[PDB]
């Protein structure tokens with residue numbers, strides 16, 4: 094792979110008083126683009142973008158039966174109100190319900206979790222820390238370019254889990270669709286270890302091509318979280334990927 | 337009694353100077369709703385809504401290997417410009433590319449198409465006519481109520497084909513998604529035999545319920561096609577199913 098820097102994308106960070114990186118990958122052309130080649134390859138905690146590999150492993154191992162199985166609220170009231178109810182895989186992904194996925198990771202266990210992250214070649218393949226929080230405050234790290242590499246394999250059903258698990262997780266990643274494009278993606282927000290950053294990783298399905306993306310950006314307060322999608326979509330619009 | 341007539345929906349037809357039926361099914365409550373019980377049970381040619389069972393059968397039989405397989409344009413220039421190119425299952429559904437599906441039906445063949453439609457309990461299960469056009473000008477008939485019955489089976493993966501086939505077709509039915517709802521659906525437009533009608537059938541996925549819908553309306557000319565979705569969405573908004 095071969096990477097072109099487009100610094101003009103930086104205008105969209107500048108005009109929103111922000112700093113970060115957008116990485117794009119044109120699947121047809123096998124060509125990548127980014128505003129910052131160095132930050133594109135900087136590895137960070139994945140935070141809730143780890144729900145993608147966690148979901149795959151839980152499904153492949155049968156910890157999750159299917160996308161309709163109900164995960165009961167553990168009763169503890171937490172600050173994000175959508176978390177304080179029962180969920181299935183679809184809504185747990187949509188609302189990024191951490192406690193549900195911590196429960197998955199406990200059941201998967203360290204041995205199988207480590208084996209699967211090596212099988213996926215996911216980030217630095219390091220799960221040091223608590224098995225139920227290592228993607229929030231442990232040793233795992235992944236860069237935006239490494240998120241693309243992983244997502245490309247998921248798109249092609251080439252990860253070493255069942256085809257069914259990959260199809261279900263891609264259903265659960267559904268974020269936006271209309272007559273012009275489909276976006277499958279996952280947000281993240283890493284706050285437990287500096288630097289506080291926001292993530293958005295996934296892809297845009299067109300009629301005749303797929304554009305993979307991965308972005309992260311400094312997130313000193315939660316009032317900037319909507320800029321994850323906003324800045325990405327402005328880059329997508331600039332490159333004429335979406336209208 | 338599982339159906340309730342709500343003639344107030346007729347306002348959405350009349351003020352678009354239209355005649356037709358909208359049928360809704362509340363999956364959680366197992367209760368149905370329509371502006372017109374009699375038209376709701378009136379069977380019509382399925383036209384392009386037949387692409388849903390046709391897709392399922394082609395996938396189950398390996399006629400279609402997956403949603404990436406390319407079906408080459410046969411070089412015949414047809415009136416709908418988007419048909420005059422290569423397609424896969426996703427784009428052939430999106431652009432309702434009849435010639436692609438006519439070829440599927442020839443490969444499926446008469447005997448296998450008949451057995452599968454009986455297994456599906458699809459409409460009147462009658463495939464009299466040409467193997468590659470019976471859903472356009474042959475003997476098969478299906479009502480809006482019978483469309484709901486079939487779609488419910490598909491949603492629950494209870495049809496008599498592989499789980500994989502059903503997941504792929506449901507992916508191919510994706511029409512709209514946002515933070516509030518997901519619509520999986522298929523349009524239709526029956527012209528070859530009177531009465532000329534337009535169809536929209538599918539469902540709305542919410543966080544905690546699924547609403548199945550099937551509508552048809554008199555379609556004397558091609559210019560009222562947009563009201564298939566518009567009128568349905570007015571009924572959905574009235575019942576507060578979508579915001």
Ligand SMILES: *C(=O)[C@H]([C@@H](C)O)[C@H]1CC(SCCNC=N)=C(C(=O)O)N1
Pocket residue numbers: 139140141142173188189191229280281282283284315318
């Ligand atoms: C995943 O990264 C986080 C988890 C680490 O808490 C969840 C929570 C959020 S943002 C909710 C904060 N809003 C109000 N301050 C996300 C997210 O990625 O949006 N995932």
Ligand SMILES: *C(=O)[C@H]([C@@H](C)O)[C@H]1CC(SCCNC=N)=C(C(=O)O)N1
Pocket residue numbers: 382383384385416431432434472523524525526527558561
């Ligand atoms: C399926 O119902 C028809 C097929 C029988 O021709 C295709 C074509 C259309 S509408 C295109 C007409 N526009 C221009 N006048 C559809 C559809 O459902 O929208 N499917």
Ligand SMILES: [Ca+2]
Pocket residue numbers: 104105108327
């Ligand atoms: Ca901008």
Ligand SMILES: [Ca+2]
Pocket residue numbers: 223225226
């Ligand atoms: Ca813990």
Ligand SMILES: [Ca+2]
Pocket residue numbers: 348351570
């Ligand atoms: Ca109106």
Ligand SMILES: [Ca+2]
Pocket residue numbers: 454457458461
């Ligand atoms: Ca029957």
Ligand SMILES: [Cl-]
Pocket residue numbers: 140141143144190191194195
């Ligand atoms: Cl998480």
Ligand SMILES: [Cl-]
Pocket residue numbers: 263264267506507510
């Ligand atoms: Cl989907």
Ligand SMILES: [Cl-]
Pocket residue numbers: 383384386387433434437438
């Ligand atoms: Cl067709």
Ligand SMILES: [Cl-]
Pocket residue numbers: 489494
């Ligand atoms: Cl049933």
